[PDB]
Paper text:
We thought that proteins with alpha helices at both their N- and C-termini might be fused to generate artificial repeat proteins by connecting the C-terminal helix of the repeating unit to the N-terminal helix of the next repeating unit. To test this design strategy, we used a protein A domain as the repeating module and generated 3-, 4- and 5-module repeat proteins. All these repeat proteins were successfully produced in E. coli and could be crystallized. The twist and bending angles of the fused helices were very similar to those of the ideal helix. Interestingly, the protein A modules in the crystal structures, especially the last ones, exhibited significant structural variation, and close structural analysis demonstrated that this structural diversity was due not to the helix fusion but to the intrinsic flexibility of the protein A module.
To design amino acid sequences that can stabilize the alpha helical structure of the fusion sites, we superimposed one or two turns of terminal alpha helices of connecting proteins using a molecular graphics program. Then, the amino acid residues important for forming a fused helical structure were chosen from the two natural sequences in the superimposed region. Our method does not require complicated computer calculations for the design process and can be used for the assembly of artificial protein complexes with predictable and rigid structures.
Numbering used by the authors: 33 to 221
The structure:
């Protein structure tokens, strides 16, 4: 009973699954050699095992996880690998939320009252992290435009004060005003 094209492809794909050690790979290959008619499920299992382990590795790559939380996720994944996907989601979720903390804490152009508002508001409900982070960034970039137009070397005071005043009036036009200031600055080198 040789292999049909389907069993041949299950064989091939199992042979090329990246995160399987040699003992797992050989076990699957010998079980496939003994009873090829299980190929399909032996593939699925070999795929499932392959992705659980991939979850492992992704947990080990998230930059804003400290090693406590990380080893908690790792050990929980060794205790029951079935739930790997749920664990992985939580691993990413917490990571991004902590990423939100980090960035918001280090935004150069927020005065510390706005920052303390963003962080406290992030501690209250972490689920809003993304929505909050953008709010921080957008706010940062807009205040950043002010000091930027303040310190462009080749501007004179009426140019500066027209851009600044126009930025004070309508901050959402920052990207335009800034982009008009820069171009004018290079115009007056």
């Amino acid at each position: 009973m040789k292999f049909n094209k389907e069993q041949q492809n299950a064989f091939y794909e199992i042979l090329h699954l990246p995160n399987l050690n040699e003992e797992q790979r050989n076990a699957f290959i010998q079980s496939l050699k003994d009873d090829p008619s299980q190929s399909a499920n032996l593939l699925a299992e070999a795929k499932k095992l392959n992705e659980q382990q991939a979850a492992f590795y992704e947990i080990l790559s998230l930059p804003n996880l400290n090693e406590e939380q990380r080893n908690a996720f790792i050990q929980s994944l060794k205790d029951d690998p079935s739930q790997s996907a749920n664990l992985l989601a939580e691993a990413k979720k917490l990571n991004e939320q902590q990423a939100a903390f980090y960035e918001i804490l280090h935004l150069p152009n927020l005065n510390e009252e706005q920052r303390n508002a963003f962080i406290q508001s992030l501690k209250d409900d972490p689920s809003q992290s993304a929505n909050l982070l953008a709010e921080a960034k957008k706010l940062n970039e807009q205040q950043a435009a002010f000091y930027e137009i303040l310190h462009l070397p080749n501007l004179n005071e009426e140019q500066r004060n027209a851009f600044i005043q126009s930025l004070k009036d309508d901050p959402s036009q920052s990207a335009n005003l800034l982009a008009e200031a820069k171009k004018l600055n290079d115009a007056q080198a």
